RNA sequence: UUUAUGCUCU
RNA sequence: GGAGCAAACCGGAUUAGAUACCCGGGUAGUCCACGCCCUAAACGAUGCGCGCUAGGUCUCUGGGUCUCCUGGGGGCCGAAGCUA
RNA sequence: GCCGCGGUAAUACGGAGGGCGCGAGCGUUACCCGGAUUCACUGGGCGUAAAGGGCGUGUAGGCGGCCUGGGGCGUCCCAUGUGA
């Protein structure tokens, strides 16, 4: 299925702290604090003027890695974004963000995108009252994201819900902290998000 | 203030009694992404020296690039030597579609939306000189009417 | 002899503008004027006037060029950068109204003969007709 | 005053080049008799008018003019008429690049200074008898070519050419630099590439002295106080 | 007015 | 029909060989009539017709109010443009 | 796969560590289209790159000067039927 195993090799192969971690990629070691270079035996050697293709590849990998998604799915969406009328570039990002496993992370129900994924695929999530265990369910302006019933306990939740007090969630979102529930209000504008990504190069990638 | 992206570095070689004598050539693009570009081709006995004087000439050859929302006014087709470039304007929200050579230029001059195709000779040197002349020939409804009126 | 009188004209012009002549005579014709007419109305020529060479009907056409430029090759731009027959005698070209061209994204004219006279791309789209597509100019 | 009457322009200043022409010289031609093309002087006036209308303007704003005349008929009539206006000129061979390569051609002028500032000074006699004649010989020719070019340590904003054909190099040389080109030209050359034209005889001292002289005057009038006639009727005929 | 020829891969 | 020339062929030289190059001979053929053959670097390696786009000079051949103009050919240099 | 690697220091062979790309799939072979404006209607050519017929005469065919009417075949417009 989705990728598994070593992650800090990505935190740092793309060469940009991208917070695939929980609280660690925040500590004085996303692994990227200690060793800010590519993994493996050659990470400490002098880089070569990258190939025009290489740059578009690394970028695509970066973004695609952030959401921890499979290329099978990652392009499923890019093609959708292409067809759909819009700015294509930013349209794409909206679709990636509209994912359940991503929302649940943006709403801080869980710390990591991967923690947020297991949370959905276990029943510890509910949409508009219904049980929803599909890390791909696309949410639209108006839905009621929320923690389930039998799941209102579990130190994991309230421990992570607490650390949410102080943090202001992005515009397109909202959260009733005390009640455990958010709402997908709108489709996140480009400006609304500052991904370390140049989405232009990701489009220039699939234009073979 | 300016931006330098070079597309071509190559090693030519003359011939003299006892060995081949080399020399280098660099194609450099110079722009501001605000509507100004320049193409310079410099050659020197070593890579950097040539790259350097490339930019030199690069600014010795500029051009108005009448943008229109990161695109161009009309569609234009231009030929240099046996090489040919087709510039068709795309609607904002598309992207710059071109090869490595025509892209580097169209980018360091603004243009974030444009459709293009190289025809005839895909030779880099000549395709570039053809793309500049292709921009150098663009006209807007403004300069269009400043032509057709009388007096 | 001449197979295409119209094309010939357009070419006579294309050749004068290249050497920057003030004008050029072209064997006259009713239809050949209607077109020459539209070239002045759209400001591609200063206009024309019926004349008589050796007692034969002609049409002096007064060309327009841009201002003397500076730097090497100090030669004016061109009011008529481009002009060529579409529909030829060897291959007639007829387009329905929905099928009308778009010369240089509106920046250029697209003369074309319709059952309501010699019109232009827009001028014809206004009437909403279409017909034989004489030539394109910019 | 400034102007000229078609009276004095009756010496020999209306034609010279027969069927040796440049057909682009249409507007400025009247009729071919005695084989030779006789150039219409009436239009010479109109252009001589419009021409000065740029010279005078340029003069009374401190603009410089560079003189080029390598012909035989138009050599001396420049060395004087130029200095008499405190302007730079070219008398002998026209070194290629002088403008497009002013940067490096000048480095050869600083040498002139450095040679002048070594005539009879605290160091010369210390140098061998062999090198002396040598160093001074490098000066002799050094000044021969760069005498009039010496002035102006910066490229001008116009040049005055005796024959845009004999000096095709310069005309285009400057033309590439956006440097306005003004010249005297008979049927030898073509207009088009001249910015301010003086359509008249470019051979025969008579015309080169008449039209170039009272042209140097119109310069000082916009400068300050036109003097009296200057070196002209030398070995004149 | 006498000459012809130069193994294989770099 | 056949003088000169000359594939083939013979001889003399040359050469390692010399069925070649050079030399001496020499038959078809080269020539004419008639009838076939249909090839070619059959070349400007550039199909034909018509209109349009500076000129300079040399030449052949017409007409001219015979310094020059005009028409049709044959060459060179060349505007603009074309061309790897 | 194409250019090409191996001749005792091989990033090109074999294994290894490491890395890159995809992931219940990953490769391979075969075939179609694309890139190929490389059959060019859009959108190519023919002096020397492949390409002007050895030259004429001419059949069918293709194309065809200026002006004015008639017809309305092409063409254009609208309406409508059909286009499951
Ligand atoms: Mg889109
Ligand atoms: Mg595509
Ligand atoms: Mg071509
Ligand atoms: Mg090719
Ligand atoms: Mg190639
Ligand atoms: Mg042998
Ligand atoms: Mg050998
Ligand atoms: Mg052997
Ligand atoms: Mg081998
Ligand atoms: Mg023998
Ligand atoms: Mg023997
Ligand atoms: Mg023996
Ligand atoms: Mg031999
Ligand atoms: Mg014999
Ligand atoms: Mg014999
Ligand atoms: Mg036989
Ligand atoms: Mg045959
Ligand atoms: Mg022959
Ligand atoms: Mg051939
Ligand atoms: Mg021919
Ligand atoms: Mg034929
Ligand atoms: Mg004759
Ligand atoms: Mg006669
Ligand atoms: Mg002739
Ligand atoms: Mg020639
Ligand atoms: Mg030329
Ligand atoms: Mg070993
Ligand atoms: Mg080894
Ligand atoms: Mg080795
Ligand atoms: Mg390999
Ligand atoms: Mg290996
Ligand atoms: Mg490994
Ligand atoms: Mg491994
Ligand atoms: Mg498979
Ligand atoms: Mg075609
Ligand atoms: Mg081809
Ligand atoms: Mg042809
Ligand atoms: Mg051959
Ligand atoms: Mg032939
Ligand atoms: Mg042939
Ligand atoms: Mg034939
Ligand atoms: Mg025939
Ligand atoms: Mg017939
Ligand atoms: Mg007809
Ligand atoms: Mg017919
Ligand atoms: Mg009729
Ligand atoms: Mg219907
Ligand atoms: Zn980390």
From Swiss-Prot, chain A:
S4 RNA-binding domain: from which residue to which, for each copy?
98-160
- Keyword set includes Magnesium: no
A Gene Ontology biological process in which this protein takes part is: ribosomal small subunit biogenesis
Co-factor binding comment: Binds 1 zinc ion per subunit. In a number of structures (e.g. 4Y4O, 5FDV) a 4Fe-4S cluster is seen in place of the zinc cofactor.
Give the protein's cofactors: Zn(2+); [4Fe-4S] cluster
Kindly list the positions annotated as binding Zn(2+).
8, 11, 25, 30
Keywords for the protein's UniProt record, in alphabetical order = Metal-binding, Ribonucleoprotein, Ribosomal protein, RNA-binding, rRNA-binding, Zinc
**InterPro entries linked:** Ribosomal_uS4, Ribosomal_uS4_bac-type, Ribosomal_uS4_CS, Ribosomal_uS4_N, S4_RNA-bd, S4_RNA-bd_sf
Which NCBIfam families does the UniProt record give?
A: PRK05327.1, rpsD_bact
State what this protein does: One of the primary rRNA binding proteins, it binds directly to 16S rRNA where it helps nucleate assembly of the body and platform of the 30S subunit. Binds mRNA in the 70S ribosome, positioning it for translation.
Listed name of the protein: Small ribosomal subunit protein uS4
What is the scientific name of the source organism?
Answer: Thermus thermophilus (strain ATCC 27634 / DSM 579 / HB8)
- As recorded in Swiss-Prot or TrEMBL, the protein's gene is named rpsD
Swiss-Prot record, chain B:
Q: Which Pfam families match?
A: Ribosomal_S5, Ribosomal_S5_C
Kindly give the Gene3D superfamilies that the UniProt entry links to this protein.
Answer: 3.30.160.20, 3.30.230.10
- Keywords, ordered alphabetically: Ribonucleoprotein, Ribosomal protein, RNA-binding, rRNA-binding
Q: Could you confirm whether the keyword rRNA-binding appears in this record?
A: yes
Superkingdom of origin organism? Bacteria
The reply on keyword Repressor is no
Q: What does this protein do?
A: With S4 and S12 plays an important role in translational accuracy. Located at the back of the 30S subunit body where it stabilizes the conformation of the head with respect to the body. Binds mRNA in the 70S ribosome, positioning it for translation.
The UniProt record's further free-text remark is: Is positioned such that it could physically interact with spectinomycin.
Comment text on domains? The N-terminal domain interacts with the head of the 30S subunit; the C-terminal domain interacts with the body and contacts protein S4. The interaction surface between S4 and S5 is involved in control of translational fidelity.
Protein name (record): Small ribosomal subunit protein uS5
Q: What lineage does UniProt assign to this protein's organism?
A: Bacteria, Thermotogati, Deinococcota, Deinococci, Thermales
Swiss-Prot record, chain C:
Q: Name one GO molecular function term.
A: rRNA binding
Name its GO BP terms in alphabetical order. translation
Q: Gene3D superfamilies from the entry?
A: 3.30.1370.30, 3.30.1490.10
UniProt entry tagged with the keyword Ribosomal protein:
yes
**Cited InterPro entries:** Ribosomal_uS8, Ribosomal_uS8_CS, Ribosomal_uS8_sf
Tell me the protein family, please.
Belongs to the universal ribosomal protein uS8 family.
Supply the PANTHER family for this chain.
40S RIBOSOMAL PROTEIN S15A
**What is the role of the protein in this entry?**
One of the primary rRNA binding proteins, it binds directly to 16S rRNA where it helps nucleate assembly of the platform of the 30S subunit central domain. The combined cluster of proteins S8, S12 and S17 appears to hold together the shoulder and platform of the 30S subunit.
| GO cellular component terms, A-Z | ribonucleoprotein complex; ribosome
Judging by the UniProt lineage, the source's domain of life is: Bacteria
Check the record and name the Pfam families matching this protein: Ribosomal_S8
How is this protein named in the record? Small ribosomal subunit protein uS8
Source organism per entry reads: Thermus thermophilus (strain ATCC 27634 / DSM 579 / HB8)
Q: Which SUPFAM superfamilies match?
A: Ribosomal protein S8
The UniProt keywords, alphabetically, are: Ribonucleoprotein, Ribosomal protein, RNA-binding, rRNA-binding
Q: Record keywords: Ribosomal protein included?
A: yes
Please give the subunit comment from the record: Part of the 30S ribosomal subunit. Contacts proteins S2, S5 and S12.
Curated annotation (Swiss-Prot), chain D:
Mind listing the GO molecular function terms for this protein? rRNA binding; structural constituent of ribosome
List, alphabetically, the Pfam families matched: Ribosomal_S2
Q: List each coiled-coil range.
A: 101-146
Q: Is Ribosomal protein among this UniProt entry's keywords?
A: yes
Q: Which GO terms describe its biological process?
A: translation
Alphabetic keyword roster: Coiled coil, Ribonucleoprotein, Ribosomal protein, RNA-binding, rRNA-binding
Q: Quote the cellular component terms of the Gene Ontology held in the record.
A: cytosolic small ribosomal subunit
Q: Does the keyword Zinc apply?
A: no
Q: How does it assemble?
A: Part of the 30S ribosomal subunit. Contacts protein S8 and may contact the N-terminus of Era.
User: What role does it play?
Assistant: Spans the head-body hinge region of the 30S subunit. Is loosely associated with the 30S subunit.
| Family stated for the protein in its record | Belongs to the universal ribosomal protein uS2 family.
State the protein's name.
Small ribosomal subunit protein uS2
Task: Tell me which species this is from.
Answer: Thermus thermophilus (strain ATCC 27634 / DSM 579 / HB8)
């Amino acid at each position: 299925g989705r990728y598994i195993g070593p992650v800090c090799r990505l935190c740092r192969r793309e060469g940009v702290k991208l917070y695939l971690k929980g609280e660690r990629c925040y500590s004085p070691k996303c692994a990227m604090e200690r060793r800010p270079y590519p993994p493996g035996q050659h990470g400490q050697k002098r880089a070569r003027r990258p190939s025009d293709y290489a740059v578009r590849l690394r970028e695509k990998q970066k973004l695609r890695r952030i959401y921890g998604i499979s290329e099978r799915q990652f392009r499923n969406l890019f093609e959708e974004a292409s067809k759909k009328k819009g700015v294509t570039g930013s349209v794409f990002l909206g679709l990636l963000e509209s994912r359940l496993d991503n929302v649940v992370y943006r709403l801080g129900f869980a710390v990591s995108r991967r923690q947020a994924r297991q949370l959905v695929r276990h029943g510890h999530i509910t949409v508009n009252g219904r049980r929803v265990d599909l890390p791909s369910y696309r949410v639209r302006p108006g839905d009621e994201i929320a923690v389930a019933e039998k799941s209102r306990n579990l130190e994991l939740i309230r421990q992570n819900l607490e650390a949410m007090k102080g943090r202001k969630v992005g515009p397109w979102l909202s959260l009733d902290v005390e009640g455990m529930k958010g709402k997908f209000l709108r489709l996140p504008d480009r400006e609304d998000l500052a991904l370390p990504v140049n989405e232009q190069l990701v489009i220039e990638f699939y234009s073979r | 203030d300016f931006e330098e992206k070079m597309i071509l570095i190559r090693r030519t070689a003359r011939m003299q009694a006892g060995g081949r004598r080399f020399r280098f050539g660099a194609l450099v693009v110079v722009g501001d992404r605000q509507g100004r570009v320049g193409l310079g081709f410099g050659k020197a006995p070593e890579v950097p020296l040539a790259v350097q004087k490339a930019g030199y000439y690069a600014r010795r050859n500029m051009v108005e690039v009448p943008l229109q929302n990161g695109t161009i006014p009309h569609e234009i087709e231009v030929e240099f030597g046996a090489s040919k470039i087709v510039l068709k304007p795309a609607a904002p929200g598309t992207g710059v579609i071109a090869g490595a050579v025509p892209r580097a230029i169209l980018e360091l001059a603004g243009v974030t939306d444009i459709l293009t195709k190289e025809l005839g000779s895909r030779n880099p040197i000549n395709i570039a000189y053809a793309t500049m002349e292709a921009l150098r020939q663009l006209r807007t409804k403004a300069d269009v009417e400043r032509l057709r009126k009388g007096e | 002899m001449l197979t295409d009188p119209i094309a010939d004209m357009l070419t006579r012009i294309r050749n004068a503008t290249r050497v920057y002549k003030e004008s050029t005579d072209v064997p006259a014709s009713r239809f050949k004027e209607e077109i020459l007419r539209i070239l002045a109305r759209e400001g591609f020529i200063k206009g024309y006037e019926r004349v008589d060479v050796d007692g034969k009907p002609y049409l002096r056409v007064y060309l327009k060029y841009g201002p003397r430029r500076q730097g090497p090759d100090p030669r004016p731009e061109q009011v008529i950068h481009h002009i060529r027959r579409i529909s030829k005698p060897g291959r007639r070209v007829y387009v329905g109204v929905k099928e009308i061209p778009r010369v240089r994204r509106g920046l250029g004219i697209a003369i074309l003969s319709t059952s309501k006279g010699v019109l232009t791309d827009r001028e014809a789209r206004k009437l909403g007709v279409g017909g034989e597509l004489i030539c394109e100019v910019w | 005053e400034i102007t000229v009457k078609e009276l004095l322009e009756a010496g020999v200043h209306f034609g010279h080049e027969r069927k040796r022409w440049n057909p682009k010289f249409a507007r400025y031609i009247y009729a071919e008799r005695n084989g030779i093309h006789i150039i219409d002087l009436q239009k010479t006036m109109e252009e001589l008018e419009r021409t000065f209308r740029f010279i005078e303007d340029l003069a009374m704003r401190g603009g410089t003019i560079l003189f080029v005349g390598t012909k035989k008929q138009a050599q001396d009539i420049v060395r004087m008429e130029a200095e008499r206006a405190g302007m730079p000129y070219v008398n002998q061979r026209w070194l290629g690049g002088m403008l497009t390569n002013f940067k490096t051609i000048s480095q050869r002028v600083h040498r002139l200074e450095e040679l002048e500032a070594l005539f009879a000074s605290p160091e010369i006699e210390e140098r061998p008898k062999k090198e002396q004649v040598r160093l001074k010989h490098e000066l002799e020719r050094l000044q021969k070519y760069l005498s009039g070019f010496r002035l102006l340590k910066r490229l001008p904003d116009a040049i005055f050419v005796v024959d845009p054909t004999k000096e095709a190099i310069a005309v285009r040389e400057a033309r590439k630099l956006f440097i306005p080109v003004i010249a005297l030209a008979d049927t030898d050359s073509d207009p088009d590439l001249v910015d301010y034209i003086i359509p008249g005889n470019d051979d025969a001292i008579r015309s080169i002295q008449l039209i170039l002289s009272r042209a140097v005057d119109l310069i000082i009038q916009a400068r300050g106080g036109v003097v009296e006639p200057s070196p002209s009727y030398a070995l004149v005929q």
